[PDB]
Design a protein around this ligand. Structure first.
Ligand SMILES: [Mg+2]
Ligand SMILES: [Mg+2]
Ligand SMILES: [Mg+2]
Ligand SMILES: [Mg+2]
Ligand SMILES: [Mg+2]
Ligand SMILES: [Mg+2]
Ligand SMILES: [Mg+2]
Ligand SMILES: [Mg+2]
Ligand SMILES: [Mg+2]
Ligand SMILES: [Mg+2]
Ligand SMILES: [Mg+2]
Ligand SMILES: [Mg+2]
Ligand SMILES: [Mg+2]
Ligand SMILES: [Mg+2]
Ligand SMILES: [Mg+2]
Ligand SMILES: [Mg+2]
Ligand SMILES: [Mg+2]
Ligand SMILES: [Mg+2]
Ligand SMILES: [Mg+2]
Ligand SMILES: [Mg+2]
Ligand SMILES: [Mg+2]
Ligand SMILES: [Mg+2]
Ligand SMILES: [Mg+2]
Ligand SMILES: [Mg+2]
Ligand SMILES: [Mg+2]
Ligand SMILES: [Mg+2]
Ligand SMILES: [Mg+2]
Ligand SMILES: [Mg+2]
Ligand SMILES: [Mg+2]
Ligand SMILES: [Mg+2]
Ligand SMILES: [Mg+2]
Ligand SMILES: [Mg+2]
Ligand SMILES: [Mg+2]
Ligand SMILES: [Mg+2]
Ligand SMILES: [Mg+2]
Ligand SMILES: [Mg+2]
Ligand SMILES: [Mg+2]
Ligand SMILES: [Mg+2]
Ligand SMILES: [Mg+2]
Ligand SMILES: [Mg+2]
Ligand SMILES: [Mg+2]
Ligand SMILES: [Mg+2]
Ligand SMILES: [Mg+2]
Ligand SMILES: [Mg+2]
Ligand SMILES: [Mg+2]
Ligand SMILES: [Mg+2]
Ligand SMILES: [Mg+2]
Ligand SMILES: [Mg+2]
Ligand SMILES: [Mg+2]
Ligand SMILES: [Mg+2]
Ligand SMILES: [Mg+2]
Ligand SMILES: [Mg+2]
Ligand SMILES: [Mg+2]
Ligand SMILES: [Mg+2]
Ligand SMILES: [Mg+2]
Ligand SMILES: [Zn+2]
Lengths: 181, 118, 23, 112, 83, 69
RNA sequence: CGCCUCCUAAAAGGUAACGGAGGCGCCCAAAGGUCCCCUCAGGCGGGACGGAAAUCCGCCGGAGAGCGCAAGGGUAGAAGG
RNA sequence: GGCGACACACGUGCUACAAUGCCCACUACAAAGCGAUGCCACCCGGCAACGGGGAGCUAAUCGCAAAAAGGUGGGCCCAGUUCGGAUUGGGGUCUGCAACCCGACCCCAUGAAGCCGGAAUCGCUAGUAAUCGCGGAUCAGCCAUGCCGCGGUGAAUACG
RNA sequence: GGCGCGUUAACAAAGCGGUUAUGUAGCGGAUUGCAAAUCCGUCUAGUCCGGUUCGACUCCGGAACGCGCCUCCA
């Protein structure tokens, strides 16, 4: 495992504040990050084209990971979509690639967001997990306006071993998650 | 997002390019270039990022732009909406605000014509 | 154009003066 | 009677094309007066002239008291004016008729 | 606008009625005709019956409407739409 | 990780316009951002921009009070 | 008018009526063999476009899903992916 | 308070859709009128609208006054744009007792529809049509892009 | 009662498992002294109930109404 700026910050500064603020007796009771799972629910390339191959190309430039295709569980007429069409891209980030992703997410990407008023403090799982969406891909550093060709955002899932929202609210904010209210 | 959260057209003049951003008219187009020591009549395809960030820092600090402009005006009309002032009514129903006639035109304010039978 | 009040000819058309057509 | 809904039968009288036009003047007059009474109107039978009038119009006035109010209109209404159809500028005397009928029961028939 | 180097206009038979009542321990419903009047902080709180040509409209006044006139909030054109 | 499919990560030097520099890892060895965390208005406290308001409407106009008592 | 499923059928099998209800006259080159891996429907909360329902995360959920097509039986300790 | 409304429909015009053009700087050439709670020179504060001063003129004398297209030079490069100027927000000026309904003008931002217009249809035969700017009446101010005028530049075509 | 066919918008009437039918009318415009004719445009849908299907005006079953045929020898 390599030195990751946010990884250090978790261990040196976030760990003891949580123990302090919550009082766990066991070094494993203190909440952690489990994984970050990114999902572009593209669904436009249902039949229109093979535009996914470019989005998996960019999602790999952002996370360092080639994502996997998601396909339609059933068939939907109104969505103009049959069962089994490639309709999205999921990538699962763990360990360092998870850290390295959020480090850039919080430091440069969430700032470079247009008209940013902070993350919604109400998007917590109800069981200690958090989810936020996005509208673009140039928000992330590695995506230039030259290479862009379509405006595709994503959903972001951050999973924590915290049992409650309040334990997870503290864990994320102590890492650098700008919460609106 | 070159400046103010918007990429600005290349192969164009830097005063014209700044107009290609929400909140920068021709009067503000020149204001920076003189007050930033920046040659107005040259491409964006030949600019150092010293001038660029000098230009970017100038316009994003001095001037309410892109998002903040849009939201602020968006809030101002809303106050007239809330209180029940005449301009607030005429902002709801899509009628004019500045006292124009309505018997005929206003089509910009009222979209394409809703032709009627009878 | 003669309606663009922010120009020389626009102010000419309206016959008024300002930053764009001064006296 | 007085409280039930009403059917109004407007028919062009002597006058030809101008009687039919006047019939439409009588027609619009009643539809408006219905509004200024909280009454609901609905057209059941309309026979327009290509000039804008009606050789016959039949409409209901729905609302408590329609036959109470509209009943005083059943008769012949005379117009005296210079018709839009006149070209020598003369005054013609045309007529339109109004018929006021209380709304009926579609009562079902079965054998005793 | 009425140019600022003049006095911000109030018909001054009305601003009287709003500060003569700040003394008296208000508040009343004051019926007016000077729609042409800028709202002042001395009016915030009262009820004024801004005429509109036919009827007296109760127009309470709040703290988001100071610069605006009394006659804005008493329109005169009943519309409802068309159709 | 599977070979041949993933864009290899190298130590990166992202760069904001404000001279802020971030020791991270990325697909590019250097990027040049224009906004960052260290200078974002929402981030650097309030850092209230040109909106140091007070509204400043409208009772606060106080552009008069000459009107008599 | 032949064939299949259920009931009638009286707890083995069988059992009729111009009795009550459905279906078949195909299909699949994988929808076949084997080895390996995997587990549903649905409910709640959460998440840009994105909705009742597209894809993503969490929790609950033994089978009510799925098994090409009727019905029944069978079935996730797989026959399902 | 309304005559200024607005699901709609028609007439008369304005402004456009651009390169024979737009923009900016600089330099030209008219006529007819108006002008004493009036024209306003000139100067200062003002990006400006204007505000402060302040000559001359009862006016072939003083002023409105810049005429404008044009001429020269420079810029925009075919892009719903250095076309277009609608809509709206905000900040001001002026008149007038009073600018909400409902005025006009300036400044900042906003930059819409519109790529030359279906069936159809109007004007004009020469200094005319086209285009260009200027004045006046009414008038506190102005919703005038209207009307009555004024000159600048200046064609095409008429077999029949 | 049996058997066959049908129900679509203002009317008449079609195709279709995914889709401005069409004609006439009606509606806005043109033209005309005006109306018609004509010209430029434009437009409202699938009888109810229940199934199949990703999806039903369209397929299956029933109802309701309408049409057509038959009801003979005892
Ligand atoms: Mg411990
Ligand atoms: Mg919550
Ligand atoms: Mg958790
Ligand atoms: Mg701009
Ligand atoms: Mg305004
Ligand atoms: Mg106007
Ligand atoms: Mg109006
Ligand atoms: Mg005659
Ligand atoms: Mg690695
Ligand atoms: Mg046999
Ligand atoms: Mg057989
Ligand atoms: Mg048995
Ligand atoms: Mg049995
Ligand atoms: Mg037995
Ligand atoms: Mg046996
Ligand atoms: Mg049997
Ligand atoms: Mg083979
Ligand atoms: Mg099989
Ligand atoms: Mg199988
Ligand atoms: Mg196999
Ligand atoms: Mg949900
Ligand atoms: Mg959802
Ligand atoms: Mg089952
Ligand atoms: Mg199936
Ligand atoms: Mg079946
Ligand atoms: Mg009038
Ligand atoms: Mg006009
Ligand atoms: Mg005069
Ligand atoms: Mg003049
Ligand atoms: Mg545009
Ligand atoms: Mg367009
Ligand atoms: Mg322009
Ligand atoms: Mg007004
Ligand atoms: Mg433009
Ligand atoms: Mg072009
Ligand atoms: Mg033409
Ligand atoms: Mg002649
Ligand atoms: Mg011209
Ligand atoms: Mg005048
Ligand atoms: Mg004039
Ligand atoms: Mg029968
Ligand atoms: Mg049919
Ligand atoms: Mg029919
Ligand atoms: Mg046919
Ligand atoms: Mg057929
Ligand atoms: Mg048709
Ligand atoms: Mg037609
Ligand atoms: Mg027609
Ligand atoms: Mg139906
Ligand atoms: Mg169905
Ligand atoms: Mg169905
Ligand atoms: Mg359908
Ligand atoms: Mg049907
Ligand atoms: Mg059927
Ligand atoms: Mg016989
Ligand atoms: Zn920075």
């Amino acid at each position: 495992p390599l030195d990751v700026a946010l990884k250090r910050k978790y261990y040196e500064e976030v760990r003891p504040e949580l123990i302090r603020r919550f009082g766990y007796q066991n070094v494993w009771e203190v909440p952690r990050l489990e994984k970050v799972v990114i999902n572009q629910g593209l669904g436009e390339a249902k039949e229109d084209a093979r535009i996914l191959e470019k989005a998996a190309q960019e999602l790999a430039l952002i996370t360092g990971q080639k994502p996997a295709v998601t396909r339609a569980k059933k068939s939907i007429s109104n969505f103009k979509l049959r069962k089994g069409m490639p309709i999205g891209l999921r990538v699962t980030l763990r360990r360092d690639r998870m850290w390295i992703f959020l480090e850039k997410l919080l430091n440069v990407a969430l700032p470079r967001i247009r008209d940013f008023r902070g993350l919604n403090p109400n998007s917590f799982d109800g069981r200690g997990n958090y989810n936020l969406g996005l509208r673009e891909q140039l928000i992330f550093p590695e995506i230039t306006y030259d290479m862009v060709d379509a405006l595709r955002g994503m959903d972001i899932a951050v999973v924590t071993t915290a049992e409650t929202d309040e334990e997870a609210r503290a864990l994320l904010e102590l890492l650098g998650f700008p919460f609106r209210k | 997002a070159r400046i103010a959260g918007v990429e600005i057209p290349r192969n164009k003049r830097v005063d014209v390019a700044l107009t290609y951003i929400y909140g920068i008219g021709k009067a503000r187009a020149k204001e920076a270039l003189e007050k930033t020591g920046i040659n107005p009549a040259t491409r964006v395809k030949d600019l150092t990022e010293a001038e660029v960030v000098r230009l970017r820092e100038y316009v994003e600090n001095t001037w309410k732009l892109e998002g903040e402009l849009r939201a602020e005006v968006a809030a101002n009309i809303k106050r007239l909406m809330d209180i029940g002032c005449y301009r607030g009514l005429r902002h709801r129903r899509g009628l004019p605000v500045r006292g124009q006639r309505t018997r005929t035109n206003a089509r910009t304010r009222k979209g394409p014509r809703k032709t009627v039978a009878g | 154009g003669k309606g663009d009040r922010r120009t020389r000819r626009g102010k000419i058309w309206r016959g008024t003066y300002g930053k764009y057509r001064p006296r | 009677m007085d409280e039930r809904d009403a059917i109004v039968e407007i028919r062009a009288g002597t006058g030809g094309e101008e009687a039919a036009l006047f019939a439409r003047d009588l027609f619009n007059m009643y539809l408006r007066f219905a509004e200024e009474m909280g009454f609901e109107t609905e057209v059941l039978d309309s026979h327009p002239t290509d000039l804008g009038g009606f050789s016959k119009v039949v409409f209901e006035v729905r609302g408590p008291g329609a036959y109470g109010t509209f009943k005083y209109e059943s008769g012949v209404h005379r117009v005296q004016r210079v018709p839009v159809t006149e070209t020598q500028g003369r005054i013609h005397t045309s007529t339109a008729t109004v018929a006021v009928l209380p709304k009926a029961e579609e009562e079902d028939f079965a054998l005793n | 606008p009425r140019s600022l180097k003049k006095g911000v206009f109030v018909d001054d038979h009305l601003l009287e009625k709003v500060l003569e009542l700040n003394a008296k321990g208000e508040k009343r419903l004051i019926k007016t005709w000077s729609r042409r009047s800028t709202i002042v902080p001395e009016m915030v709180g009262h009820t004024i019956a801004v005429y509109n040509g036919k009827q007296h409209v109760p127009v309470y006044i709040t703290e988001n409407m100071v610069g605006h006139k009394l006659g804005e909030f008493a329109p005169t054109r009943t519309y409802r739409g068309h159709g | 990780m599977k070979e041949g499919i993933h864009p290899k990560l190298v130590p990166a030097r992202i760069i904001c316009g404000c001279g802020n520099v971030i020791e991270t890892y990325s697909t590019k060895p250097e990027i040049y951002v224009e906004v960052c965390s260290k200078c974002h208005p929402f981030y650097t406290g309030q850092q209230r921009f040109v909106d140091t308001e007070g509204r400043v409407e409208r009772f606060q106009r106080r552009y008069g009070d000459s009107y008599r008592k």
